[PDB]
Design an enzyme around this catalytic site. Sequence first.
Site, PDB file in Angstrom:
ATOM      1  N   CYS A   1       0.787  -1.225   0.000  1.00 56.64           N
ATOM      2  CA  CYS A   1       0.000   0.000   0.000  1.00 56.64           C
ATOM      3  C   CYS A   1       0.834   1.297   0.000  1.00 56.64           C
ATOM      4  O   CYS A   1       1.548   1.620   0.962  1.00 56.64           O
ATOM      5  CB  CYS A   1      -0.959   0.026   1.195  1.00 56.64           C
TER       6      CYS A   1
ATOM      7  N   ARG B   1       0.138   4.517   2.898  1.00 58.63           N
ATOM      8  CA  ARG B   1       0.332   4.301   4.326  1.00 58.63           C
ATOM      9  C   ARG B   1       0.686   5.544   5.149  1.00 58.63           C
ATOM     10  O   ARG B   1       0.559   5.504   6.380  1.00 58.63           O
ATOM     11  CB  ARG B   1       1.316   3.157   4.582  1.00 58.63           C
TER      12      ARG B   1
ATOM     13  N   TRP C   1      -8.913   6.197  -0.701  1.00 62.46           N
ATOM     14  CA  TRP C   1      -9.234   6.902  -1.939  1.00 62.46           C
ATOM     15  C   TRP C   1      -8.220   6.482  -3.006  1.00 62.46           C
ATOM     16  O   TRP C   1      -7.106   6.038  -2.683  1.00 62.46           O
ATOM     17  CB  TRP C   1      -9.264   8.428  -1.739  1.00 62.46           C
TER      18      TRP C   1
ATOM     19  N   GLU D   1      -4.354   3.662 -10.610  1.00 62.51           N
ATOM     20  CA  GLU D   1      -5.247   2.511 -10.381  1.00 62.51           C
ATOM     21  C   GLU D   1      -6.374   2.519 -11.429  1.00 62.51           C
ATOM     22  O   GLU D   1      -6.740   1.480 -11.999  1.00 62.51           O
ATOM     23  CB  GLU D   1      -5.866   2.535  -8.954  1.00 62.51           C
TER      24      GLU D   1
END
Lengths: 404, 405
Positions: free
Chosen positions: B109, B112, B281, B286
């Site tokens: 991720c 973070r 979000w 992505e």
Amino acid sequence: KFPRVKNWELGSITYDTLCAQSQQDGPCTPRRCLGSLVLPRKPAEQLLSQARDFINQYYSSIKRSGSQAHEERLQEVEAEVASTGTYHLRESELVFGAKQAWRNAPRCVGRIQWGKLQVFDARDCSSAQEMFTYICNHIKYATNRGNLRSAITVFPQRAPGRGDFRIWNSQLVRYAGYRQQDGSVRGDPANVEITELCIQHGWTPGNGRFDVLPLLLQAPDEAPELFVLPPELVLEVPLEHPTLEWFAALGLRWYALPAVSNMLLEIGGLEFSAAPFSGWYMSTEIGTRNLCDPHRYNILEDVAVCMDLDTRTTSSLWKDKAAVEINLAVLHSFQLAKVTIVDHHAATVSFMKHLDNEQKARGGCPADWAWIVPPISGSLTPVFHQEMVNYILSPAFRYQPDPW
Amino acid sequence: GPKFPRVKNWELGSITYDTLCAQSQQDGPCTPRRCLGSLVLPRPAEQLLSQARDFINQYYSSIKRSGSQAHEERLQEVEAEVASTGTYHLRESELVFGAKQAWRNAPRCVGRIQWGKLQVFDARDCSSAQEMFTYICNHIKYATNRGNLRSAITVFPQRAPGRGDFRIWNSQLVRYAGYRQQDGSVRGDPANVEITELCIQHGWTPGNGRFDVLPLLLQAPDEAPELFVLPPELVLEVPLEHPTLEWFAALGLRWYALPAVSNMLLEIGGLEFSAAPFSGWYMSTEIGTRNLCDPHRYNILEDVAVCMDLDTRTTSSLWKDKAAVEINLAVLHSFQLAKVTIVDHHAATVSFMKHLDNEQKARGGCPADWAWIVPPISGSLTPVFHQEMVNYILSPAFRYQPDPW
Ligand code: HEM
Ligand code: HEM
Ligand SMILES: Cc1cncn1-c1nccc(CCNCCCc2cccc(F)c2)n1
Ligand SMILES: Cc1cncn1-c1nccc(CCNCCCc2cccc(F)c2)n1
Ligand SMILES: C[C@H](O)[C@H](O)[C@H]1CNc2nc(N)[nH]c(=O)c2N1
Ligand SMILES: C[C@H](O)[C@H](O)[C@H]1CNc2nc(N)[nH]c(=O)c2N1
Ligand SMILES: [Zn+2]
């Protein structure tokens, strides 16, 4: 057991069984993966087992395993090690070993070409001056008026209790990085240290952004010597953009021949401290890494301002847009100059084909995903979606310490 | 010098050492003989208690009470609880710490930096599929906040010995349908073909658009999954347009505002939360790169390239690179225009570099998956590209779990 390897674009699945042939430890352990590190953190029977293994590979390669020549050659190597602590390759073995090292290089996206490698034996070299001659011929052969050909020149192996043959430069052709005491660097910041070394060994420096460095060549236990390459041997390409007429005004240019000169080549336990090799650039190396890396020429902003882009915010993607035009300029300029080059899409497409060839031929292919995936447009290329297994096979190219 | 992995940044020339990896209890897939780091899915009361003990220690360390009377009592209370029931139960604030620590621990991720500001919804009282639906709706409303997105997780009851799991069958709370067509092609999102056909088998009346929002397939213990349609007003979407290419809006493309992963297992102190959807979000790539341009997803690269009149017959025109950039720009531009939170890949990776430096100070390292942290376009243009990373499993953790069917 054996790694199940998946391509996520196609759904296809292979199993790597080749990795079981690895006799050398990489940096990972079950506790933590260190696959993204650039560099590794750091008797007679050992050499002999590596020797026999390679000789076995070789005779297997020419379909003569078990033959009279095979068994004899094993005894030759065995008799030589037992008496002298070392041995010597035959040229044909060396040619094969060099090819396999390329083939085994997990970071190289150009390995579809591995079977096509011109191998210069330079093991009869006794002086820096002789090294220069060989290097000069390598470049002439490899450059070939822009129709680039893959080549390697192999200098005398290392020997116990004797200095190494070394080329101090990291590449046969590279631009100087002159440190101006006002913090900045004129030229290539990656080469500040080698540039300083050259000056200190008596080179008269320039003050351009693209001054081709001289070579520092070192024969064993001798101070290195300085050699300026004949400008007619160093093919260079002026950068211009197909539509952006202002791009040429940046004065940018790059050399044609990428030739790594500081890696160590290991075959059958023997080590060759000087074995420069060259191929042809994949465009992103020049357009993205060399020209846009913040710690290299770092031209992103310059181009972006010339394109009248909004440099104020990240979300305008000015960086991405600039980078694309810079890579376009490289491909265009190299094509216009008739110098061999491969774009990252063509390159990765051919690597997939290589992965497929290798699966059939050997049961897998060691690959370093982080290096195979190009520095721009990652997932737009097929290798992004291809899982890869990384391991060390021998013969192999290795990093080695800088000789200074 | 030190017996820990040395980590280098090649842009800046700086060096750190990861000491945090020494606290990893679970092995990843790599060995000294081969690195499997690039693989997406790599393959008793005693075990429970040692994990429970570890988490309780972690908890008390975090509130600076390690060694205290309360620490030793919680340790004994967990032990006695496991000794009479085979399992144990977390206090609310333990659950909150664990949820945040699982996010903090997620090597893949890039977001973070925000780990400390997660909203934890305790839904451990949920006792039906209908009730899961209510909690999910509340989660979506809270997390969406009319475009001003807020990180959140809702935690449903843990795996219980000899009892069925709470499971959300969908991989995300919001995702588009994928309709297999008679010619072999796919209408909508090919990623979602199977889940679409599962919804149909379970009584969903399917649409036939490129962007039909899937209903939820929710499963309470030892019961058949029940179907729930999200009310369209709860599901905020963003129509895609380009700031200068006027025709882009005519492609009729759109994406949903709220990314919410719903099929991952949340593990804390050996307890398993099989349903614990989390939302944040989007990072713009992505949507613009993976979801819209992946060959096996919406695959719009060629369409956009044709509209831009590029030379799609040769790789060296960089038509893929050009289109891809304009699509990502459109995503960013559209989300901004609709005032829906989004972060481009540059801002995100800069913030992640900051996160890495914070964590270096706070824990002596930060587990990170280079291949996933580096964005799928413009890799070396972002600072994380030049940052070596160490990857390892820390608990509490989010982990993949088999599909419930
Ligand atoms: C012929 C066309 C070739 C192309 C297009 C090509 C391309 C590449 C690329 C893109 C990389 C990534 C590393 C970097 O960014 O510098 C690489 C690495 C590498 N290549 Fe090649 N290559 C070619 C030929 C060769 C040849 C002839 C050899 C040796 C005989 C070779 C051996 C290697 C090795 C050992 C590395 C790893 C270097 C390192 O780890 O620093 N390649 N290549
Ligand atoms: C706050 C804004 C956030 C951003 C920008 C963000 C960004 C990302 C991105 C780009 C990935 C790459 C994975 C992919 O390509 O699918 C990822 C993975 C992941 N994130 Fe986040 N994230 C955010 C919030 C969160 C939150 C709130 C949680 C949990 C509490 C979380 C947990 C995870 C986990 C477990 C993964 C790995 C998923 C996998 O391995 O499939 N993230 N994140
Ligand atoms: C000739 C060739 C064939 N295949 C790749 N090349 C090629 N050409 C030109 C350049 C390079 C670079 C190869 N990798 C070298 C960079 C890795 C590092 C290793 C240690 C310190 C550093 F700053 C950086 N490779
Ligand atoms: C809400 C959130 C917070 N952080 C990331 N997300 C987020 N949002 C939306 C989507 C995703 C995807 C996360 N990874 C999804 C798993 C990808 C796979 C992994 C293995 C097999 C597959 F088919 C597919 N993550
Ligand atoms: C940290 C990371 O491994 C490092 O920056 C790597 C990533 N991938 C790369 N890929 C290529 N082709 N060349 C490189 O120098 C690097 N550098
Ligand atoms: C084969 C490869 O490991 C796979 O495509 C990975 C690579 N990196 C990724 N990175 C992110 N952020 N998301 C992904 O789905 C993937 N997929
Ligand atoms: Zn690894």
